[PDB]
Amino acid sequence: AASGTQNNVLRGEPFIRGGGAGFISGLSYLELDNPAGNKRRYSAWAES
């Protein structure tokens, strides 16, 4: 007799105030491969 089980959850929740409307939706688009933010998009948000 054999039994096996798995579970996974991910939640991620970027929130932004200030920024240009497009740069905001750029930065806040969550990267599974880089959950903090793509550095160029983040720098562009920090410009906008």
């Binding site: 991910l10 939640r11 991620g12 932004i16 240009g20 497009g22 905001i24 939706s25 998009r41």
Partner: protein
Amino acid sequence: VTLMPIDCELSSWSSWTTCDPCQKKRYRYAYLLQPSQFHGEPCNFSDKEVEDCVTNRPCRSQVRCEGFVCAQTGRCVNRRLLCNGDNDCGDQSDEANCRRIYKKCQHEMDQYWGIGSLASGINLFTNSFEGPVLDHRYYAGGCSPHYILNTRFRKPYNVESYTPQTQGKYEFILKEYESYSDFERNVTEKMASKDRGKHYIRRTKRFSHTKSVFLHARSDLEVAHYKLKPRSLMLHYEFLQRVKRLPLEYSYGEYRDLFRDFGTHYITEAVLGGIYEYTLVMNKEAMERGDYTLNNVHARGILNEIKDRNKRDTMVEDLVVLVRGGASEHITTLAYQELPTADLMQEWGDAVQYNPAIIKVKVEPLYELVTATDFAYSSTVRQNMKQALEEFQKEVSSCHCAPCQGNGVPVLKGSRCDCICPVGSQGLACEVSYRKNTPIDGKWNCWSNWSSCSGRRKTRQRQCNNPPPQNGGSPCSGPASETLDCS
């Protein structure tokens, strides 16, 4: 499909009101008693009947235009607006015969985007803009320089603030569940003698697998905030002219048409946005059975052997995307089935700046527009309009509509109820699906109108509507019974 369609019914007519002293007409109306649904025949008749009159009661309809009468529209405009180089009357009347014109705006100045769209009142029950109530092309002098990015804008006189208020949210979830099982059970037995022998075998497998993947990603982008002034408002002339056509006598049908033409409430504060909701929902299953047996005897001899082997695999997957602000090239590529590459998302949000939807909004009942500086016998028109507004809410609220199959949602536009169908079910009632069952979300019947005065009660039931059939969701959003003072 399990249907026999419901054709429309309006009521038998009211008695006539007596003739109005100022409108010189009389009116009769019917309640909508049962909406058109399942493509049952409409009976709309534009919901009204009206006739002329010969009565001679006194009328005080001459509320003075103090400034200048806009000859076509019947608006009045204050005298500093004549020859301001702008159309304050609607039909350019104010700028006739200008011995000089004086300009004010030193530069070209865009309207803030959607500011003329916000100018229209909502039917709060379909959640729809119906038609134009405040003149968002009126500038009262104005020409104060406002900026968003490097673009420059003109603010309508009616609006307190339009400002970017530039805020954004993203919320993401991914979930997986998996479960596996495998069982194998066997038997073997033997005998021999010197002559005879015997043998027996069983082998077995039972197996199962399951997965879900669920993903939801929502973004809300809020890159303008609108607030309308509290009062001192300047009305759109098409609204103003149905208001000047309302009876001072009470007969609900003429007041009903104002809510149809101009909405139930006017939009007073709104956050103006784009939304990009994405959901991907997956359920996956697999199963197997394998079974194998033998029996043998020897003395002469005999053999029996059997195999039974089985497999199933399935996926059900649903995806929904909603996007509510931007420009059509971005909007379609976001609307594509794939999770949007952040360049798209950038160019979409950049266009939300130029074409928002309303995200969240606070609204005031339209009778607060009706005012003594704008209409004769105004306070009677208000009291009438308040009563009609309550009766209209009882008509437009969806509760009359028979329940959709497949957890469909009714919105009751015009005088027809049409069931909006989710992903995975189709047809007029949303019946047609490959699926076994769907969870149902609850809503009440129409509420009982009132009990007596000296403490008054309203009551609601869910008899067909209820969640328990096929294991539904929430039954409720408010109080299953309701009571108040009479005064």
